[PDB]
Design a protein around this ligand. Sequence first.
Ligand code: ZN
Ligand code: ZN
Lengths: 147, 123, 50, 160
Amino acid sequence: NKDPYFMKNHLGSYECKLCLTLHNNEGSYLAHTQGKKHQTNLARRAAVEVKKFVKIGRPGYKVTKQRDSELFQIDYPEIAEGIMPRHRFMSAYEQRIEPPDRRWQYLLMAAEPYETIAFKVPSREIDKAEGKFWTHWNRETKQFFLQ
Amino acid sequence: SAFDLDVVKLTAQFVARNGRQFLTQLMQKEQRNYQFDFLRPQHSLFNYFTKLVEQYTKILIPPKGLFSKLKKEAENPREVLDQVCYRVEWAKFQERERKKEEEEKEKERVAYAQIDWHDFVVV
Amino acid sequence: KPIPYWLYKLHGLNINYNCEICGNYTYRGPKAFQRHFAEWRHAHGMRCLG
Amino acid sequence: QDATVYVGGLDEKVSEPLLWELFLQAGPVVNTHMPKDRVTGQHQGYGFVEFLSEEDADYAIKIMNMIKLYGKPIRVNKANIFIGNLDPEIDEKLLYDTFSAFGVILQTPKIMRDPDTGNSKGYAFINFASFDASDAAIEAMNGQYLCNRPITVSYAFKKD
RNA sequence: UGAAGCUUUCAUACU
RNA sequence: UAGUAUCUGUUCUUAUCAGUUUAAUAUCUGAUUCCUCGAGGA
Ligand SMILES: [Zn+2]
Ligand SMILES: [Zn+2]
């Protein structure tokens, strides 16, 4: 059968390792399985709300890039909320139409009353897209900067 | 670590009596073949040496005990109790500000994990 | 439940050997006692004297 | 346990006499032990080498640390974010220093260990200060090239 | 972790 | 034909000493009112 205790030795006689027993044929082993010894040996071995309420009118954003050396400026209107716009780097493998030859990355900045503005980065790593590291959001002038 | 702490205390005591920022008793000792690795800001002991120099500068204040005598902290337990209550109120305000900053960070993390990342627009 | 009368009589059991070097720990049947001198507790008891 | 050195990061090419032959130049390795698995019946990558003196085990731990044996990061040692497939050559302080570049750590991290050997199990758990450091670890560190071992950072608990 | 002995009405195999 | 072996079944108070015997066990031979729900156990 499929039980690991039943096996075939080099001699070819059947043998139950669970009971340490030898049987001449299959019927003797099956009669041993119904016996007290095999049952006792087996008994011994037995032991969402914020995403749906977000308004999307998709206004026209104003991004200004500048090649620095040692940084993009996004002009956004007044949102009147404490939620800062967040930037994140994603891949071009997921799209609404999935165009061919998409093997680059895109850093996109998104806010709640405005639409996300995305910029493609052909380079591998030239900066850091972390939010708390190299980003700033002045709510007095409503200016977003990321370097 | 007692000898290094004593050397740092001696450097903080000798640097606090200087009349300028670079004209001290430790800048000329660096050119006098005396090895002092605690003067450079790259070491971790420099942050403790700066605090020791700040304490030595605050021990030279005119109400620190050089030409005046403190009467409110030395002869008024009610003023010390009011200062302890003000410090406890400042600690409670700092804890409330930290809780508000943690709540704002949690709100920003909830807003960032619910926005649509598939609406890409390249202008 | 209790062990079968064969396990209790065939296995040298019902006879207990005690050892002062081992906290007067009373051991069971012939085979179990022989291993005891090699086991941890007896080594511990012997280290007490050095 | 003091005279024995626990080795981690062994591939299928490494064997029980092979580790004793490789550790023979470091010191007199008296015995080698490799615990076999129950489902596969082979070594799980972690083994032990019991030498004669503790100085030979210290020299083997200081010489064969973070080595590339059989295409595997073998290292000898003294015998809500989840990181998997981590190298055993790194310690808790090394993992805290590696995690300090992304974000701030709340406390000292802990690494899971095997109940038999106790050197390295294969997975570790680390907690960040805020969710921004966890997102930066899931964006950058989840897939970064570690010391000859591709690690994988994931969230331990998330609510839909 | 382990110790499977003794007996017959069994029943089954080999000499 | 009549011998052996292997499965199945049975396998003898967690109450105390002495004698025969045993390597030691084992075996054999002798001594040592109350509780529970008319009933059972000690
Ligand atoms: Zn069986
Ligand atoms: Zn003993």
